[PDB]
């Protein structure tokens, strides 16, 4: 007979809830199969003779329903129906269950270790001898626990878990809780009974069967922080371990809540596909994201480790102790951890200077949000798997930004208290979006803020506001409007926000709050002010525009003192100035006059904003006909940066931000023939060539000295003979970019032709195309060899898109737009080409708008 | 995670 699957919803019925799972997993890492018995204690809220749960790619051997114990213990068999399309299964009982009476489902199943790195999946690694060894691991977010064991796989059905793993003596098991006892079950078997967990969600259950070494430390709370990894690299886990300990202590103090587990394990999984996952008690990480080698694997690796560990541990409280009711609030989760990365490291590891990274992330978030193709942070997910791919990390970065704006509006300690009260009222339970806001509002400043209503305006609406300030005596007029950057058409939305404005004036040094809830509002000051500046600290997720002569007074403030406002404040001024120059509300003059202040600037964040906005203008001018203005603009840029370039040292000292800036400034100063830098680089290059590479060169200056070393054929042939032998990335790609900065077009065509046959060539085509002398060469070679090229690199990835867009991204003249369209017609290819043609048309537009102005501006000075 |  045929039985209709007794359920037609996407969510599980709400009236049958589990209490406690008893999981027995028995996996075989050489057969790549694993069988299991799971026991689920359940309670029915209503009478029903069917139980609906999740199971995916598991052949249910047999399932039974037990009730009671002792003389009353009863066991019935259960009929099993399977709805694979929905990843569901029904268990049909002969007589309906009794409301509130406890039952126990027992399911015997088996499956295959997943190759797809989802669920209970297999991973491999090679020891330092070539011996290939396997291990099994889990990745359940968002809904893959269905694959390791049947269950109510929704994050609001929290249960306890009693996990038991059958493994060989060779292996070693780890899970969320500590191992209580190991019992020899059979000849080659060993059962690891892990402690019973606290009430948690399914997708955070984790276990690992591996042959890992570990290194452990204990915090003041007695928590045992251990880092597991492969035996070869385990001497690379000291740093991550100390960071985990420090950050665990920080989080215990900040949340005023003890870490809710007895221990905490950071596992370095080989070829990890998700970067890291916050399994309660057993956080997993890509190898590169957790381990640190003496020979610097990267100048930014030792910071990625700290930010990763801070995020993953932040989730141990916010997210696992208190978890979202449904995936439609996952954004908040990823927001908080991401914001906590900033709050925590900023205190724990002050030497890393995480602030620059975080605020740059906010800049990128706004840049995306300002476009028509953007979505609000909070979106109703009807299926977690279908709409978990639609969500993008930029949404989560917004989330963190918004949360920072909020933390700064409300007192910092007010925010902290709201978090403490949120996590205490809701431990071991599930929360909605609005619950955090409600907890935020009930905090008293040591006017009610009504955080709920305000926050809804930022979460439920795409985009952010542009804020315009007009000052007539003591009357400060404020305007808000959806800042939409798309210049195509005139579509307008009535979006309004609750903007938590913050300002400072030339008189009072104190920060002033003002919550703009309407389109227009007026704020009265005690006395006239020399100048005023809104969005103090760059924390709020908006941009201000000063009407009348405000921009003048602020430009004068910067040029006169510039320390009057904070480093971030100056970075904000630059960013907003140019973004407003884009939407036609500020003269390009005003923006350049502003940038003039940059001769005194020492901090990295404003200098980088200024570079981000000034370099592309010069890059556009490179493809331009006349250089009589291009040279003048490059001269203006180097006059700007002359003091800052001189200030820098030729080492690898400082934070990631400072090293990156050092590299940029030195390579820039040397690529435009700055006497001091060119001569020093030639000196380093001579000494390097004398030893044939034996002499160590600072990795931050190697790009400058190699870019100068490829000038004359003498150094160029040397660098080519050197790159031939090298395979390392830092060793080879730096020399590659060096050889691509040559004033000898013969070497250029030689490199093109030879690299076509696989000498690398994907990036080489672009890095050669964006060369001032030979940029037409790279665009003309792609037309005659396009068929062979597309054949070699097929479709997808970034090769095709990086070399098609790279060769046509900085085109200034319309004569070249015709040459792009007449090419791509003769042939996600269409998407790449459409983006490229659109950006070229925008280039010609910006030229038409601003070139004649910039020329005149470059004269007055 | 990705942070991002
Ligand atoms: C996964 O499946 C594989 C098989 O596909 C399975 O591997 C086999 O396990 C058995 C049991 O451990 C192995 O047989 C043992 O080999 C060791 C090492 O040589 C011997 O020491 C053992 O002999 C002892 O036990 C005998 C019987 O009790 C005694 O007579 C003797 O005195 C010893 O004390 C025993 O022969 C076998 O070598 C492997 N490999 C293969 C190819 O069979 C593995 O156990 C499975 N793992 C899980 C977790 O299910
Ligand atoms: C894991 O995959 C294998 C196939 O790669 C499955 O093996 C099949 O099992 C069915 C039913 O037991 C047989 O009729 C087929 O002949 C088997 N195929 C092979 C190639 O052996 C196996 O069933 C999968 N694991 C589970 C738990 O279903
Ligand atoms: Zn996260």
């Amino acid at each position: 007979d045929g039985t209709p699957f007794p359920w037609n919803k996407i969510r599980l019925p709400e009236y049958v809830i589990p209490v406690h799972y008893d999981l027995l997993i028995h996996a075989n890492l050489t057969t790549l199969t694993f069988w299991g018995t799971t026991k689920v204690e359940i309670t029915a809220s209503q009478p029903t003779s069917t139980i609906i749960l999740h199971s995916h790619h598991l052949q249910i051997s047999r399932a039974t329903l037990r009730k009671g114990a002792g003389e009353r213990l009863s066991e019935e068999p259960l009929q099993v129906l399977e709805h694979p399309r929905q990843e569901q299964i029904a268990l049909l009982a002969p007589e309906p269950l009794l409301v509130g009476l406890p039952y126990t489902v027992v399911i015997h199943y088996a499956g295959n270790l997943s190759e797809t790195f989802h669920g209970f999946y297999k991973s491999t690694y090679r020891t330092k001898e070539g011996e290939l060894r396997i291990l099994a691991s889990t990745q359940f977010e968002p809904t893959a626990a269905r694959m390791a064991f049947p269950c109510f796989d929704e994050p609001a059905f929290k249960a306890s878990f009693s996990i038991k793993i059958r493994r060989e003596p060779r292996h070693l098991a780890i899970s969320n809780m500590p191992l209580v006892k190991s019992v020899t079950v059979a000849e080659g078997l060993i059962e690891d009974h892990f402690d019973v967990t606290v009430k948690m969600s399914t997708y955070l259950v984790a276990f690992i069967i591996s042959d890992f070494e570990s290194v452990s430390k204990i915090t003041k709370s007695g928590v045992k922080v251990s880092v597991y990894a492969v035996p070869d690299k385990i001497n690379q886990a000291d740093y991550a371990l100390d960071a985990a300990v420090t950050l665990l202590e920080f989080y215990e103090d900040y949340f005023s809540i003890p870490y809710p587990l007895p221990k905490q394990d950071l596992a370095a999984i080989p070829d990890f596909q998700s970067g890291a996952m916050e399994n309660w008690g057993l956080t997993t990480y890509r190898e590169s994201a957790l381990l640190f080698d003496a020979e610097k694997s990267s100048a930014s690796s030792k910071l990625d480790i700290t930010m990763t560990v801070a995020h993953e541990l932040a989730h141990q409280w916010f997210g696992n102790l208190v978890t979202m009711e449904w995936w439609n609030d996952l954004w908040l989760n990823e927001g908080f951890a991401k914001f906590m990365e900033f709050v925590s490291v900023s205190v724990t590891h002050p030497e890393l200077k995480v602030g620059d990274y975080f605020f740059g992330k906010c800049f990128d978030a706004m840049e995306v949000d300002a476009l028509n193709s953007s979505h609000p942070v909070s979106t109703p997910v009807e299926n977690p798997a279908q709409i978990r791919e639609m969500f993008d990390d930029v949404s989560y970065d917004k989330g963190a930004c918004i949360l920072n704006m909020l933390r700064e509006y409300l007192s910092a300690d007010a925010f902290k208290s709201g978090i403490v009260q949120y996590l205490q009222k809701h431990s071991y339970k599930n929360t909605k979006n609005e619950d955090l806001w409600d907890s935020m509002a009930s905090i008293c400043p040591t006017e009610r803020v009504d955080v709920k209503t305000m926050m809804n305006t930022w979460t439920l609406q795409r985009g952010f506001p542009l804020i315009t300030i007009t000052v007539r005596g003591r009357n400060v007029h404020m305007k808000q409007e959806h800042y939409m950057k798309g210049s195509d058409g005139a579509p307008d939305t009535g979006y309004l926000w609750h903007v938590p404005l913050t300002f400072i004036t030339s008189k009072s040094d104190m920060v002033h709050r003002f919550l703009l809830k309407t389109k227009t509002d007026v704020l009265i000051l005690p006395e006239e002010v020399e100048w005023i500046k809104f969005n103090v600290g760059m924390n709020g997720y908006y941009i201000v525009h000063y009407e009348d002569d405000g921009w003048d007074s602020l430009t004068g403030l910067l040029k006169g003192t510039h320390t009057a406002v904070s480093s971030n404040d100056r970075a904000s001024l630059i960013n907003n100035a140019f973004q407003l120059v884009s939407i036609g509300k500020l003269s390009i003059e005003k923006a350049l006059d502003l940038s003039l202040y940059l001769k005194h600037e020492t901090e990295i964040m404003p200098v980088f904003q200024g570079l981000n906005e000034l370099i592309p203008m010069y890059k556009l001018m490179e493809k331009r006909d006349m250089n009589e203005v291009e040279t003048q603009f490059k001269a203006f840029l180097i006059r700007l940066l002359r003091d800052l370039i001189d200030k820098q040292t030729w080492t690898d000292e400082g934070s990631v931000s400072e090293r990156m800036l050092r590299s940029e400034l030195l390579l820039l100063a040397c690529v435009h023939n700055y006497q001091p830098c060119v001569q020093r680089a030639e000196g380093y290059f001579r000494k390097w060539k004398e030893s044939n590479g034996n002499l160590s060169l600072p990795v931050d200056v190697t790009l400058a000295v190699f870019a100068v070393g490829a000038q004359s054929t003498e150094g160029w042939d040397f660098l080519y003979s050197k790159y031939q032998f090298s395979l390392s990335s830092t060793e080879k790609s730096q020399i590659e970019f060096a050889l691509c900065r040559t004033q000898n077009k013969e070497k250029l065509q030689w490199l093109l032709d030879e690299s076509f046959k696989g000498d690398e060539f994907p990036q080489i085509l672009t890095l050669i195309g964006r060369n001032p002398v030979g940029y037409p060469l790279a665009w003309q070679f792609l037309r005659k060899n396009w068929n062979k090229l597309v054949q070699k690199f097929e479709l997808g990835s970034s090769s095709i898109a990086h070399m098609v867009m790279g060769t046509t991204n900085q085109f200034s003249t319309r004569t070249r737009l015709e040459e792009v369209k007449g090419f791509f017609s003769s042939l996600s290819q269409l998407r790449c080409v459409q983006q490229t043609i659109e950006t070229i048309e925008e280039n010609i537009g910006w030229m038409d708008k601003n070139f004649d102005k910039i020329r005149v501006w470059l004269q007055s000075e | 995670x990705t942070f991002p």
Side-chain angles (χ1 to χ4, degrees), chain A residues 29 54 68 103 125 142 148 170 215-217 378 389 404 406 425 611 658 660 667 706 730 741 774 781 788 815 855:
Chain A
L29 270 51
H54 293 102
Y103 290 104
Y125 74 94
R170 172 179 54 185
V215 67
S216 309
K217 276 181 176 61
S378 188
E389 198 65 321
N404 185 43
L406 174 51
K425 166 166 187 184
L611 293 171
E658 297 183 346
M660 199 162 57
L667 201 161
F706 284 5
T730 53
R741 305 296 314 193
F781 200 70
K788 328 177 188 67
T815 306
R855 184 189 66 261

Side-chain angles (χ1 to χ4, degrees), chain A residues 241-295 297-306:
Chain A
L241 186 47
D242 304 8
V245 174
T246 303
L247 291 163
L248 263 187
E249 297 173 3
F250 172 90
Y251 283 143
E252 279 193 87
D253 177 299
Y254 185 85
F255 294 141
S256 296
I257 291 179
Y259 179 78
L261 291 180
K263 57 82 172 187
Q264 163 61 201
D265 281 325
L266 296 69
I269 303 282
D271 58 58
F272 201 64
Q273 306 295 354
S274 295
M277 173 71 180
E278 69 277 21
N279 302 119
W280 217 1
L282 181 41
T283 53
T284 46
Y285 309 83
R286 185 185 299 93
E287 279 192 344
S288 64
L290 192 54
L291 313 177
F292 176 68
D293 197 9
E295 62 93 357
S297 309
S298 174
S300 72
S301 283
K302 201 170 183 181
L303 163 75
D304 283 353
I305 288 178
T306 307

Side-chain angles (χ1 to χ4, degrees), chain A residues 695-731 733-735 737-742 744-756 758-759:
Chain A
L695 187 57
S696 281
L697 258 192
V699 55
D700 299 357
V701 305
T702 58
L703 274 183
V705 316
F706 284 5
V708 309
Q711 290 301 69
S712 296
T713 307
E714 182 50 19
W716 195 105
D717 277 319
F718 182 109
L719 292 183
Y720 161 63
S721 309
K722 185 53 53 185
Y723 168 76
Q724 169 184 343
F725 309 142
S726 175
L727 195 284
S728 310
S729 289
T730 53
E731 199 179 28
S733 65
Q734 283 194 341
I735 302 178
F737 172 79
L739 300 185
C740 293
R741 305 296 314 193
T742 310
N744 182 344
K745 297 180 181 178
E746 171 176 321
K747 293 293 182 183
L748 197 66
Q749 194 66 28
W750 193 106
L751 291 178
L752 304 173
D753 297 357
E754 263 298 7
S755 294
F756 198 10
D759 285 0

Side-chain angles (χ1 to χ4, degrees), chain A residues 276 341 357 393, chain B:
Chain A
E341 311 184 25
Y357 178 96
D393 291 59
Chain B
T2 158
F3 54 84

